[PDB]
Amino acid sequence: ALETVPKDLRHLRACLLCSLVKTIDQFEYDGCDNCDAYLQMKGNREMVYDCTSSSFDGIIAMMSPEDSWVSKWQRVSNFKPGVYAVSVTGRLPQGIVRELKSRGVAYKSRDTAIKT
């Protein structure tokens, strides 16, 4: 859709669950298109700046996650096609990871980048 493409290249971030790369206006107006019932990041800026960070790199144009070699390697085949990232550094605080396990969402470390 037209909402998952970031409009402007300035002030864009990436989430730590689905690595959704968008602009700061879409994460606040619309939020995470791949998780809205567990994260609820539409309607504020503290939750957008808490889970989603700017420290990320690498950009991919995911279009057919059901048939592509890159989507299975990043475990993003059960997500919506759009702008994604390949290494989103950081970690969630011990304030939102405890509720994700009780609801059935296994928070995985999307950081496939190596350390030294």
Partner: protein
């Protein structure tokens, strides 16, 4: 398993290239001329050519036809062997972490190893820890 092709782009226009081809795909997925591409890879460590996912070489030629950023590398489409689908996604150590060690680019303490103290959430400025090397206004006039 889909193949990966390498196309040539303008130096300085990698992210603009990706954000333009994504909007072409969304602008033609419902017409009689769709796009056969799966994804386009654009690493941040490269500067000059990008990567694209398609099964055959005719699909990249019939998809990138009409773009002015990809008119130079339009006559030739190299192919990588299968063991190179993995080294493209590797990133060596974003680059924003407190209590870390960064250096300067401009100003007076050029190429001087410093430390980060606090990060501003506005993504405008950043706190740095350096040591002053001025004369305390004794030698200069």
């Amino acid at each position: 398993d889909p193949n990966l092709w390498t196309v040539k782009c303008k130096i300085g226009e990698e992210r603009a290239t990706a954000i333009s081809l994504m909007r072409k795909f969304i602008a033609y997925q419902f017409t009689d001329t769709p796009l056969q591409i799966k994804s386009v890879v654009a690493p941040e460590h490269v500067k000059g050519y990008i990567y694209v996912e398609a099964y055959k070489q005719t699909h990249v030629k019939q998809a990138i036809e009409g773009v002015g950023n990809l008119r130079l590398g339009y006559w030739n489409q190299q192919m990588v062997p299968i063991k190179e689908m993995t080294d493209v996604l590797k990133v060596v150590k974003a680059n924003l972490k407190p209590k870390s060690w960064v250096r300067l680019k401009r100003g007076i303490y050029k190429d001087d190893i410093a430390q980060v103290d606090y990060v501003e959430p506005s993504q405008n400025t950043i706190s740095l820890k350096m040591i002053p090397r001025i004369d305390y206004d004794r030698i200069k006039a």
